[PDB]
Amino acid sequence: PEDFQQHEQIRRKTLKEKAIPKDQRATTPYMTKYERARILGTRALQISMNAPVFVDLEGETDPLRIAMKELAEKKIPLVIRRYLPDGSFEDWSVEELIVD
Amino acid sequence: GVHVSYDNSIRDADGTLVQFMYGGDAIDITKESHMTQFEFCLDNYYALLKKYNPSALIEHLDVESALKYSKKTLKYRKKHSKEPHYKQSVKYDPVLAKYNPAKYLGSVSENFQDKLESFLDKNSKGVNEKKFRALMQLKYMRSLINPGEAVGIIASQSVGEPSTQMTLNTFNVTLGIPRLRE
Amino acid sequence: MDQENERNISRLWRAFRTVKEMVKDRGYFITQEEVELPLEDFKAKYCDSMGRPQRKMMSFQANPTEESISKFPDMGSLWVEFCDEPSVGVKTMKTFVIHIQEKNFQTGIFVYQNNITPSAMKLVPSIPPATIETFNEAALVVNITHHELVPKHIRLSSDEKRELLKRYRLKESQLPRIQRADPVALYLGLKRGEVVKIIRKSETSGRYASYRICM
Amino acid sequence: PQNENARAEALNLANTDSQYLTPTSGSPVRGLIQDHISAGVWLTSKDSF
């Protein structure tokens, strides 16, 4: 009944008081060594499961080496969510981060 | 569970804060190896400029801000140089305590700042001094500890591993590992 | 013969300067000429003709500076009290407990010599607005904040305690803790839940600002 | 290891090339040991034509 809607409304409002907006986030604009290992991990784990690839793969059979080529041209469609230690988070996309 | 957070603080896994910066200045040990070797960086300026490439980098991080605040705190500290530590007036807290090192260019620990001044002042050498600060203050920014780094484990391994090297006897004071067990 | 009448004064002149250093560090108004008072002058103002020390004239009232008022609004008067009795009974606290509460001092310091009675130690929380802070004068010979291993503790008003906790997104109990009976927490006179700020010199970085809460 | 979230992290985080400097003092821990040392003293010598 409505007792679900009383709980979903709380869950998403609580998830609205943790989202820091794009003008007010105060973490680093760099891709911090662990995003890059997990972005190339997760994107290669998608390409091996028939994801749409946005790079001209030229005979590269390794799924991890494909993701390393989707990263160099900013073609990876992922979003990092940086958790601050009270729970609140900043959503940094992969195109706007700066890779090492 | 002690790890660097995204605000450079050193916090336990449950959130109970341990430190506010790693070491005082949030530098990885495996990055500060040539950080004060200023003579090596001036020789290799053009080769190190396109490692720390500032051209595709400056519109994402603030340049003018922490340079302005550092020269307040530098000159003001040069006033009260002979006053003792308990009479130090605390108008100007350090620039790392106000500005994120990985976001504001020039926000630099006060010990790296003085060594860079003491190199540029005591040495007159197609490189200016404005473009050597802006590389060595970019090298500082690209040599910071990353968030999520397991500094709790690394600090506990860097003590426990070279204590497999001090097991020996007198070649008074409690020596070696039984002092470290206390 | 005067190897102890002369040396009880040196144990008292140093303890008197430390409390005036302790009061000025808490933000009250002490001039510099009163802190740096030479031993030649202390005898001629607080010791009698007999050469002995008398402590009734040593006790004084401290008012906050105008600069501490814009930082801490609610900061009243401080009454430092030296006691001429070696063992403090229970009816001489009642002199000082009433003298705080009648005259309306917000804070009273009761410097004693040997001990205060455990029957008289119940009169410390006996005033719920006003605090009584007792120091044994043997522990006041050396101002511990001048030591090299002790950094500059500065206490934060809630206008910047709150701005501390908003930057780092902290509950108050997640800060590093300083004890209620720490030798520097008793120095600054910290109530519970007051963040003190520590600026210490790292070997790596130089001046490094850290924080620590009193619980 | 058995998935691409672990191949990516043995190639980028725990590989030997990133472990060049130790975290205890920043000293390098990888280099040639016994007989490569005693050949560069002959190869980079001034008799070596």
From Swiss-Prot, chain A:
Keyword Transcription: yes
Region annotation Leucine-zipper: where it falls in the sequence: 57-78
Cellular compartments per GO CC: cytoplasm; nucleoplasm; nucleus; RNA polymerase I complex; RNA polymerase II, core complex; RNA polymerase III complex
Domain of life: Eukaryota
Keywords: Cytoplasm, DNA-directed RNA polymerase, Nucleus, Phosphoprotein, Ribosome biogenesis, Transcription
GO process terms (BP): nucleolar large rRNA transcription by RNA polymerase I; ribosome biogenesis; RNA-templated transcription; termination of RNA polymerase I transcription; termination of RNA polymerase III transcription; transcription by RNA polymerase I; transcription by RNA polymerase II; transcription by RNA polymerase III
One MF term in the entry's GO annotations: DNA binding
Cell compartments where the protein resides: Cytoplasm; Nucleus
UniProt feature coiled coil, ranges: none
Subunit architecture: Component of the RNA polymerase I (Pol I), RNA polymerase II (Pol II) and RNA polymerase III (Pol III) complexes. Component of the RNA polymerase I (Pol I) complex consisting of 14 subunits: RPA135, RPA190, RPC40, RPA14, RPB5, RPO26, RPA43, RPB8, RPA12, RPB10, RPC19, RPC10, RPA49 and RPA34. The complex is composed of a horseshoe-shaped core containing ten subunits (RPA135, RPA190, RPB5, RPO26, RPB8, RPB10, RPC10, RPA12, RPC19 and RPC40) where RPA135 and RPA190 form the DNA-binding cleft.
Note: Present with 6090 molecules/cell in log phase SD medium.
Function: DNA-dependent RNA polymerases catalyze the transcription of DNA into RNA using the four ribonucleoside triphosphates as substrates. Common component of RNA polymerases I, II and III which synthesize ribosomal RNA precursors, mRNA precursors and many functional non-coding RNAs, and small RNAs, such as 5S rRNA and tRNAs, respectively. Pol II is the central component of the basal RNA polymerase II transcription machinery. RNA polymerases are composed of mobile elements that move relative to each other.
Protein encoded by which gene: RPO26
Parent-protein start and end of this portion: 55 to 154 of 155
Swiss-Prot record, chain B:
Cellular compartment(s): Nucleus, Nucleolus
Family classification: Belongs to the RNA polymerase beta' chain family.
Subunit description: Component of the RNA polymerase I (Pol I) complex consisting of 14 subunits: RPA135, RPA190, RPC40, RPA14, RPB5, RPO26, RPA43, RPB8, RPA12, RPB10, RPC19, RPC10, RPA49 and RPA34. The complex is composed of a horseshoe-shaped core containing ten subunits (RPA135, RPA190, RPB5, RPO26, RPB8, RPB10, RPC10, RPA12, RPC19 and RPC40) where RPA135 and RPA190 form the DNA-binding cleft. Outside of the core, RPA14 and RPA43 form the stalk that mediates interactions with transcription initiation factors and newly synthesized RNA.
Misc. comment: Present with 2840 molecules/cell in log phase SD medium.
Record's function text: DNA-dependent RNA polymerases catalyze the transcription of DNA into RNA using the four ribonucleoside triphosphates as substrates. Component of RNA polymerase I (Pol I) which synthesizes ribosomal RNA precursors. Besides, RNA polymerase I has intrinsic RNA cleavage activity. RPA190 and RPA135 both contribute to the polymerase catalytic activity and together form the Pol I active center. In addition, subunit RPA12 contributes a catalytic zinc ribbon that is required for RNA cleavage by Pol I.
UniProt protein name: DNA-directed RNA polymerase I subunit RPA190
Section covered of the full-length record: 1029 to 1224 of 1664
Curated annotation (Swiss-Prot), chain C:
Example GO BP: transcription elongation by RNA polymerase I
Pfam families: RNA_pol_Rpb5_C, RNA_pol_Rpb5_N
One GO molecular-function entry: DNA binding
Highest taxon listed in the record's lineage: Eukaryota
Alphabetized UniProt keyword annotations: DNA-binding, DNA-directed RNA polymerase, Nucleus, Ribosome biogenesis, Transcription
Subcellular location: Nucleus
GO cellular component: nucleoplasm; nucleus; RNA polymerase I complex; RNA polymerase II, core complex; RNA polymerase III complex
Gene3D superfamilies membership: RNA polymerase, Rpb5, N-terminal domain, RPB5-like RNA polymerase subunit
Family from the record: Belongs to the archaeal Rpo5/eukaryotic RPB5 RNA polymerase subunit family.
Stated role: DNA-dependent RNA polymerases catalyze the transcription of DNA into RNA using the four ribonucleoside triphosphates as substrates. Common component of RNA polymerases I, II and III which synthesize ribosomal RNA precursors, mRNA precursors and many functional non-coding RNAs, and small RNAs, such as 5S rRNA and tRNAs, respectively. Pol II is the central component of the basal RNA polymerase II transcription machinery. RNA polymerase complexes are composed of mobile elements that move relative to each other.
HAMAP family: RNApol_Rpo5_RPB5
Subunit structure as annotated in this protein's UniProt entry: Component of the RNA polymerase I (Pol I), RNA polymerase II (Pol II) and RNA polymerase III (Pol III) complexes. Component of the RNA polymerase I (Pol I) complex consisting of 14 subunits: RPA135, RPA190, RPC40, RPA14, RPB5, RPO26, RPA43, RPB8, RPA12, RPB10, RPC19, RPC10, RPA49 and RPA34. The complex is composed of a horseshoe-shaped core containing ten subunits (RPA135, RPA190, RPB5, RPO26, RPB8, RPB10, RPC10, RPA12, RPC19 and RPC40) where RPA135 and RPA190 form the DNA-binding cleft.
Full protein name: DNA-directed RNA polymerases I, II, and III subunit RPABC1
